[PDB]
């Protein structure tokens, strides 16, 4: 299933 | 008027008056502005080609232009509006594209330190982008940081198509990430976007470039001095004046992958997934090898065990992308205008 992941950006 | 001018540094942006509160992004040799889309109450990306001074621009903006619109798939840049303020041929100068906006580039994220899963699932993206681009017979080949783009939700999309195009047989794609074959100018075929992945790979491992070459030349000796001399069999396939600087060249050993990628820079194998430092570097190993025969094809990335466990045919298998080359300026200038109006 479609992760749910994050990136932390500036 | 449906227009109206804003200075953007020194250049003028003369947009329509729906997208409101321009911003630079981005710069380019076309310049990138983030706006609010007032009519679509979203975010949008606006690029001003700044498009047919030569007969180089004419083919980068007239090829950006055809596969912006085909292509449709949730790795790859889609296409909002294209516009001109000028309201006729003649008139014609100023192309403006305008897309989805993202949150920034992959630069950003080679100066971060990722998990498995973030690596893992940004790579498997950018084989869907390049996979979806393959299936239509259509090689990105300047694949690099700045052309790929990130949301904070971890999404990606693949950015330049001014270079795309068929598998083919001069210095347009960056130096860093060029292949053998267009180093060494042999033909290229889809894999050589492969090459561009493990450059960018290997980048994102070490937090710097892999082959920083000091010039078109010298970025022969940085890869050979990294993988190794190729082989007599790949020797023979080099044009006999291409091939007679390289067999001059000294002889490399190379270095293991082992040696090259060690497990204290791919991030610590996670106890709540099963994707390992093991096989990123086996992935990588199998994406940087000099002779494209050798090298393996997006498919067989896909379903690398690294990569795998994100496998959905429906970004993966998706349909591809329905594509419906020489002339002069004024009949590119006619081309592109006649192209603009049409959507
Ligand atoms: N849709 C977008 N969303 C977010 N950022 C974007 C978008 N389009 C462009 N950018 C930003 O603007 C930069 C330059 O865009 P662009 O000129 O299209 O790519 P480029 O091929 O790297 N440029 P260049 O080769 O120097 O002409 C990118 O590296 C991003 O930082």
């Known amino acids: 299933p479609r992760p749910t992941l994050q990136l932390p950006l500036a | ?343």
Request: glycine residues 4%.
């Open chain 2, 1 to 343: 008027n449906n227009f109206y001018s804003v200075e953007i540094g020194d250049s003028t942006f003369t947009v329509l008056k729906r997208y409101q509160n321009l911003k630079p992004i981005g710069s380019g040799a076309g310049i990138v502005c983030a706006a609010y889309d007032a009519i679509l109450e979203r975010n949008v990306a606006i690029k001003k080609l700044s498009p047919f001074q030569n007969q180089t621009h004419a083919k980068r903006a007239y090829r950006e232009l055809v596969l912006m619109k085909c292509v449709n798939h949730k790795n790859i840049i889609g296409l909002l509006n294209v516009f001109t303020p000028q309201k006729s041929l003649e008139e014609f100068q100023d192309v403006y594209i305008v897309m989805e906006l993202m949150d920034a580039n992959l630069c950003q994220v080679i100066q971060m330190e990722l998990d498995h899963e973030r690596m893992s699932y940004l790579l498997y993206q950018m084989l869907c982008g390049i996979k979806h681009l393959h299936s239509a017979g259509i090689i990105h080949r300047d694949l690099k940081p700045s052309n790929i783009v990130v949301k904070s939700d971890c999404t990606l999309k693949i950015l330049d198509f001014g270079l795309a195009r068929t598998a083919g047989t001069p210095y347009v794609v960056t130096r860093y990430y060029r292949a053998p074959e267009v180093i060494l100018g042999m033909g290229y075929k889809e894999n050589v976007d492969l090459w561009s992945v493990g450059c960018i790979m290997g980048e994102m491992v070490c937090h710097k470039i892999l082959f920083p070459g000091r010039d078109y030349i010298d970025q022969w000796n940085k890869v050979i001095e990294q993988l190794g001399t190729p082989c007599p069999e790949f020797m023979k396939k080099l044009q006999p004046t291409v091939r007679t600087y390289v067999e001059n060249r000294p002889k490399y050993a190379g270095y293991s992958f082992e040696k090259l990628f060690p497990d204290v820079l791919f991030p610590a194998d996670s106890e709540h997934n099963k994707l390992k430092a093991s096989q990123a570097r086996d992935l990588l190993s199998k994406m940087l090898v000099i002779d494209a025969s050798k090298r393996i094809s997006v498919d067989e990335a896909l379903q690398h065990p690294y990569i795998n466990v994100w496998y959905d045919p429906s970004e993966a298998e998706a349909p591809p992308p329905k594509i419906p080359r020489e002339h002069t300026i004024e009949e590119w200038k006619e081309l592109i205008y006649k192209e603009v109006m049409d959507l």
